[PDB]
Symmetry: D2
Subunit: 295 residues, 4 copies
Amino acid sequence: AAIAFIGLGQMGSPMASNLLQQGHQLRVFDVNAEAVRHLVDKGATPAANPAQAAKDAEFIITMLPNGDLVRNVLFGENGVCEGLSTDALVIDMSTIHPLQTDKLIADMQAKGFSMMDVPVGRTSANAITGTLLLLAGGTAEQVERATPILMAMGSELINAGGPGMGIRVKLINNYMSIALNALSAEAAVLCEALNLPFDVAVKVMSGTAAGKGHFTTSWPNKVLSGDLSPAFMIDLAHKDLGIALDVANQLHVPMPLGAASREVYSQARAAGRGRQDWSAILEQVRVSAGMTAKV
Amino acid sequence: AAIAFIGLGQMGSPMASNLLQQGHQLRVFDVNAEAVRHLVDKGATPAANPAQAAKDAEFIITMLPNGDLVRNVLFGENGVCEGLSTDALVIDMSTIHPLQTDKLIADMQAKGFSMMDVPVGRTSANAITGTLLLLAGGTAEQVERATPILMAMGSELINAGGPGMGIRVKLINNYMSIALNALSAEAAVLCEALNLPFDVAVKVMSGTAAGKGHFTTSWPNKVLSGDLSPAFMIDLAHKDLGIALDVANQLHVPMPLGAASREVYSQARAAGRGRQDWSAILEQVRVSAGMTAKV
Amino acid sequence: AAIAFIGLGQMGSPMASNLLQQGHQLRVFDVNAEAVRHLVDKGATPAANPAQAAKDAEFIITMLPNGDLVRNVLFGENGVCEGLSTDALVIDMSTIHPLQTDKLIADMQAKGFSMMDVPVGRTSANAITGTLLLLAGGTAEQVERATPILMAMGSELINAGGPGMGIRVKLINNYMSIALNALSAEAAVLCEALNLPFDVAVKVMSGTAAGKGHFTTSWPNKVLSGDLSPAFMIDLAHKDLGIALDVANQLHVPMPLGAASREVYSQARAAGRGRQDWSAILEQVRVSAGMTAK
Amino acid sequence: AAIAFIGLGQMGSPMASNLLQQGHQLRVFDVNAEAVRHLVDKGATPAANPAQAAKDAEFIITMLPNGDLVRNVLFGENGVCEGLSTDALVIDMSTIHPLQTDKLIADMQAKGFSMMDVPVGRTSANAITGTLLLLAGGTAEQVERATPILMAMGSELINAGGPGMGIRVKLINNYMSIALNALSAEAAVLCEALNLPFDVAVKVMSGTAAGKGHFTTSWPNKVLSGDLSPAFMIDLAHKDLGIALDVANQLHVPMPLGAASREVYSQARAAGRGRQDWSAILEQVRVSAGMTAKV
């Protein structure tokens, strides 16, 4: 197919490279002329701007650092919209604000253009080997049309379930992993301060929610089944957090996420949940967010 | 064997019950006379106080709510120490402050008595079926001697690798799981606010550090190998957290752990780590705790 | 003077109203037709868009909700720049991102136009009576030129000392007051949970840094003089926070700012500051922010 | 008067010294022999233990680091209670847990002894000059009886309004001042990172709640009068916090208290308070603590 590829960064370059290997004709653009030259050496045609990249393209892929740059490439001076056919499909593979993705898709549809969000999981090493995780937003029809192109860049495609759902699931995933890293560090540094070999902690945690997560362990048969009868009471969880923070403060291990988490359990106790299962923290956060209680 | 069991609460009662089933002779004590009566009906001998429970016992188990109650049962009026043989082994299976465990073990050794820490993972349902996770502190010799008794109450034993290491690994495990629950709730409620079905997010997160944890995914070949060359740069992780918090604040989903986590990544960027792998957050927290940089 | 006023919200409407009262000729624009009509009834000339508002104006005031809207009104379709004289002075009185203010001022200077930041302190009640606090950014020349106009809308002018310094001081002020409100609430609710009448706590706190602030009490003769010898050691402050959080957690009073503050003191103790004066927390935060130690 | 003084630390030594200057006869005790020697040189009589210090004393003052040490000095081996007259008055000037103060006062009353809590504000420099703030707990009768003694050590007495109210107001004061210091540092460092001279910020803040506090400015005529009609809406305050956090994160100034504060305003918005006065944050925190809404 005729493809325009805008954004030849650490992810974009290997993604574009895999499309060339699968026999697509690429017109490429990036602000960095050396990055363009590298794709031209692999068989891409250079374009002077996004509009020229888009001219006669069936698929327009953007892979850019943020939503302001995506908007500028699509709607700015010499933007994709100046070169775009109404039969073409724009695929934004960028990680940007989901409400910016919604507004770009709406603004494209107002001009008779089709756009879908397919951000990716895994890092540039996986981009090189075409083993990215494709988080495919867009309509079922758009995902079906894009899939042959997308499978050149990734090895696994997840149906995110609609326009803007790809960037939403990417954002939930990255929010959880990035925050989890800071909490993981607190546990590991407290472990070191207590002179406990980390491998012993990892062995224990690999067998509990500590290492496996709550989503598929503690939650399914309790809060997610509407059952808050306790396996492990909020009062006990709150007590154990207080012990961890007592130790951390005696050993000068700063634990901001632990300190914040205890005040969440304290709010749950103030709301009368002390004898509920620890999975009831999900319902407490829903109520704090103004949502209707499910249990 | 001849066993004393002190503490017949939601965990202790079924633990004591399993020891009776395996043919041990138990002398039991608790402040609740009905809890004692229930074990006496199953063939336990009652004790008037901990000293009487301990008399002629080879193994003395405590399962109590906190370190002050363990100290009072061991060292107080009619305490275990008044009835204890120097050949006997005290096993505290309580979840208490680890520096309190160390001081109890030291105070016992000063009187020529042997004591180890074997707190347990999993909840009272597992206590009933003898499927607790045994977190065995103590010397190699103590863990070897206690193992046949402990396997009556649990189905898996982890050798924590020394006196006080059992209570340490229990505290690290519970700190991590209890705080993780609060973070998991933030991610799940943001997911709901963005109209993304939870199961779709869990399917994606099950394949990344979000669902699998950093301990065995992102950390081993980076920070834990002394390599902070980036797979995923701190600058990008910090930017994505900012987007998550922007969305949460627009949708009034309070995310205190996320908000705290972004200020940790901000401090990492201030310390010059913006171009390092996200696993460098472990080193940042070590430095914040006054530890010497490893990388 | 000939003034354009863009933004007739809860602050903008009474500010524009005070300029009319002091005899200025105003050309007004807002997207809300009722807000424009209210100013027209007081003697303003309506303009169809920002460009037309700016035409023949000596001073162009913007009072808008955020920096994206200020940029759109200045640089967008029918924007101020299409009607602006190089002799005119643009005054943004909005509370927006300070780095956006810097970029707007620079973008205006690149087109030969003059722009200054004069955000305002105090509320719409003060906007009605012309008793706002004027937080005047801009060059000394711009502040001098604007002052006669600004004194129609405010009763007190602070010269913030340069382009972008007005929005900076407004942001520092509001950051501190808005966050302080959340901490004040934690202290007041813990007070109630301990069955202590609030008036007793306020009487005590009015005599200490609790009620008077650290900026002019504990800091000047210690950290701000480069003296970290202790009047009140970080170790003691950290211990007392632990007691407060123990009580709050027993009484189920959630104290997230207190919980966060103890982990800041914990980091100071990790950095070897436990025997330093509590004012050394400022130096700890500077180091955490990557600044050169004092 | 005949006074026993137990605790000759950085605060206790100068407090005892001022009682000597005002012509009282002191029996002093501390485990630190250098501190005792210094007071003996100023005319104090040394005592071997608290019981001997208390013998024939009308007033017994304790100034100790924590509630366990106060309990040990009053009720332990050779404790004050062994030397105490029922006509004497015990004054604990320590900063300890208020529920420990309550239990000490109750335990003393059970033995027919009278005890009040009079902790102090201001630092050791003020202790030297007798210019401490006296935070007088106790009954009206106890405060009246103690006042002549207390005015030797402090220049201002506040009647806290009952037994245990002195330690409560000391804890509220120190909680607020100690946490405020950390918030003050965030504002001052953000100021420096923006290249704004700090003196300009202090001049502005001295005229607003930023420098004067909310307790006597924004609160009295709004939330404390049951009026949540907005002078400054929660929505606007929340927006401005988001701008401050955006700037802090771009300039890598870590602002954990600011980050936490924005999630409190976010919870207020979730509870429907966005168009309420910012003083409604007090009501939000009361509701989060399980208290009945007032307004």
